[PDB]
């Protein structure tokens, strides 16, 4: 069932409906009688077949749980560096901009099976300090998910050693604060800060136009 469920992809994209009824002769009007189709449809209705997995797998192409990381260019090398930081014994922070990547990142982190805690504007005030002290103390939580405006401005997280940026709109002072939440007084290990920039996109033009202009301020991205 696993090889069938994983290796059956293609679908017969062209079909004619109501041809299955006519090929056997059982329809609303035919040369056969009235309860031939009824007794045949009932004896068919009782008899089962073990090929229903291949039938349902071949009728509709199943968009299974694996395509969360394969449809995203940023999620291709993200799990590789999370495995590399897992094997080296490091903790990481993730800072995003909008909340629509937070639930997708929660489904990805639940897919790869780590221990995480999310902090954003949808949480309460009571769970915030307990979720802060849970990550600051020695635990098994590797990744701690935050946001830019809510939890990446004034907290004192000294546990993590890695900052991961998915997207950065404003970076003369604003994105510097998010990576400065990690680097604090209570850190004795060096901070490795990564950044996710795509290829031949707008984000590829932002840092390329900012490298020549020494990264003062961006106005209009046009290329």
């Amino acid at each position: 069932r696993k090889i069938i469920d994983t290796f059956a992809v293609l679908t017969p994209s062209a079909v004619s409906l109501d041809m299955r009824k006519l090929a056997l002769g059982l329809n609303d009007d035919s040369s056969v009688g009235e309860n031939t189709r009824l007794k045949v449809m009932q004896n068919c209705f009782e008899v089962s077949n073990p090929l229903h997995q291949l039938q349902t797998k071949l009728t509709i192409a199943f968009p299974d749980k694996s395509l969360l990381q394969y449809d995203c260019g940023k999620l291709q090398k993200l799990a590789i560096l999370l495995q590399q930081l897992k094997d080296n014994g490091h903790r990481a922070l993730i800072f995003t901009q909008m909340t629509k990547v937070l639930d997708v990142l929660e489904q990805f982190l639940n897919y790869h099976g780590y221990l995480y805690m999310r902090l954003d504007g949808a949480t309460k005030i009571e769970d915030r300090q307990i979720l802060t002290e849970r990550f600051n103390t020695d635990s098994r939580i590797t990744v701690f998910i935050l946001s830019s405006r809510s939890g990446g401005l004034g907290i004192n997280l000294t546990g993590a050693d890695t900052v991961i940026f998915y997207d950065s709109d404003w970076n003369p002072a604003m994105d510097k604060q998010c990576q400065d939440r990690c680097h604090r007084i209570g850190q004795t290990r060096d901070v490795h800060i990564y950044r996710f920039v795509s290829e031949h996109t707008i984000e590829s033009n932002i840092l390329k136009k900012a490298n020549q202009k020494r990264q003062l301020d961006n106005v209009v991205i046009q290329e």
Binding site: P12, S13, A14, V15, S16, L17, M19, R20, K21, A23, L24, L26, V40, M41, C44, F45, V47, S48, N49, L51, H52, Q55, T56, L58, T59, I60, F62
Partner: protein, 434 residues
């Protein structure tokens, strides 16, 4: 990383807007007439009006006929359907070669359609008859943003009984097709049991009823197989309809008349657009005389598009005939409706640019002395022997830890590997059939 097998160095013909072909452009050196004339064939397929035109490519080995076939197949683009085919492949024992030949003529053509379908999804609340019955089931799908109840056919209800769903399971139901997929138990019942084989999926966001439009392309031969035999279904009558007679048969002309009748009705509604394609037949000299004589009437037919042939012979005997001697292995009536594009050979410097550009695509570094030696082997043994020996020189460079191809590596390739004429010269001297 990147697999290169006698191809992938050609990104098309590489012609200008005026028509004049460059000397070095797009993995091609020389061959101006076949590339520019091949671009005239490319525009001829881009006309979407011509049909019945047959242009064979005749030449010797290592001259660039199949490379020109990948040049026109790459110059047309993915939107134009390309059907690679060999004349040795048309022999079949299930049906005749006529059905495979005319069927391939229906395989070359394409037709893109646009259609909208309805999408229903939600958590199953009640499975109950209406109030009185003949056994139908109202399925109350609880989505996130809405709650709606719908009445279904007994066949899709039978597939619902097949999926073993219950109260509180997220399903996926398509309106026009009737296929049923289960996503899993909803997240509200995750705390009912501590361990369960059924995975827990969240509730689907959005409405209950959803619509979208697809620009899906599907070939006309795929519509012919869809008009010929039953493919599959989820019921017993459809699966036994498949299992009873799945052996493919010949197709009558009236079936194609109804297929292109409703296809012509779809192009009268403005929904679809008819685009011709390319059937490329390899090794036409291997064809029988029956396929040639059906190609005579088949090129007189209407839907036969621009077909490109490739024959590598001359005044030889046709297969299936005893005394008939004709050029290219093609009968003179089929050769009269054919168009011949003569292929030009290559000099020593052009062999040097073939080995050079093939070496740059192969990402190997060749020194100038080994480049001139591979040029002399290109002008002594063959082109395919030098292109065949590009890789073992880099292998011996890897074993000798060198990054460039040297004289001793290609001479060691001359000692470890022999060409045609050394093999014949060795096999001329025999003690007991050497």
């Amino acid at each position: 990383v990147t697999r290169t097998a006698a191809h992938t160095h050609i990104k098309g013909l590489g012609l200008d807007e005026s028509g004049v072909a460059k000397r070095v452009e797009g993995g091609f050196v020389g061959q101006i007439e076949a590339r520019e004339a091949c671009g005239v064939i490319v525009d001829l397929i881009k006309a979407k009006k011509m049909s019945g035109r047959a242009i064979l490519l005749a030449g010797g080995p290592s001259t660039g006929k199949t490379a020109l076939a990948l040049a026109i197949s790459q110059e047309l683009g993915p939107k134009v359907p390309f059907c690679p085919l060999v004349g040795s492949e048309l022999y079949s024992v299930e049906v005749k070669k006529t059905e495979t030949l005319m069927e391939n003529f229906r395989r070359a053509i394409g037709l893109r359609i646009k259609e909208t379908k309805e999408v229903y999804e939600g958590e199953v609340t009640e499975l109950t008859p209406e109030d009185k019955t003949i056994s139908h089931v109202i399925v109350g799908l609880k989505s996130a943003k809405g709650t709606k109840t719908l009445r279904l056919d007994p066949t899709i209800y039978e597939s619902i009984q097949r999926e073993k769903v219950s109260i509180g399971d997220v399903i996926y139901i398509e309106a026009n097709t009737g296929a049923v997929k289960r996503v899993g138990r909803s997240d509200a019942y995750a705390t009912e049991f501590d361990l369960e084989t059924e995975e827990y999926v969240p509730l689907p966001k959005g409405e209950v009823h959803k619509k979208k439009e697809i620009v899906q392309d599907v070939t006309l031969h795929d519509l012919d197989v869809a008009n010929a035999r039953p493919q599959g279904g989820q019921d017993v009558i459809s699966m036994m309809g498949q299992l009873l007679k799945p052996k493919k048969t010949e197709i009558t002309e009236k079936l194609r008349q109804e297929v292109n009748k409703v296809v012509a009705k779809y192009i009268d509604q403005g929904v679809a657009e008819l685009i011709p394609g390319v059937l490329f037949i390899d090794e036409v000299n291997m064809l029988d005389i029956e396929i040639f004589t059906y190609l005579n009437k088949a090129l007189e037919s209407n839907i036969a598009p621009v077909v490109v042939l490739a024959s590598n012979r001359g005044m030889t005997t046709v297969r299936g005939t005893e005394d008939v001697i004709s050029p290219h292995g093609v009968p003179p009536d089929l050769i009269d409706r054919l168009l011949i594009v003569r292929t030009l050979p290559y000099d020593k410097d052009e062999i040097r640019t073939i080995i050079e550009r093939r070496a740059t695509v192969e990402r190997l570094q060749v020194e100038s002395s080994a480049l001139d030696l591979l040029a002399t082997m290109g002008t002594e043994t063959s082109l395919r022997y030098a292109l065949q020996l590009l890789a073992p020189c880099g292998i011996l460079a890897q074993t000798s830890n060198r990054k460039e191809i040297v004289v001793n590596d290609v001479n060691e390739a001359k000692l470890l590997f022999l060409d045609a004429k050394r093999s014949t010269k060795i096999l001329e001297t025999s003690a007991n059939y050497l």
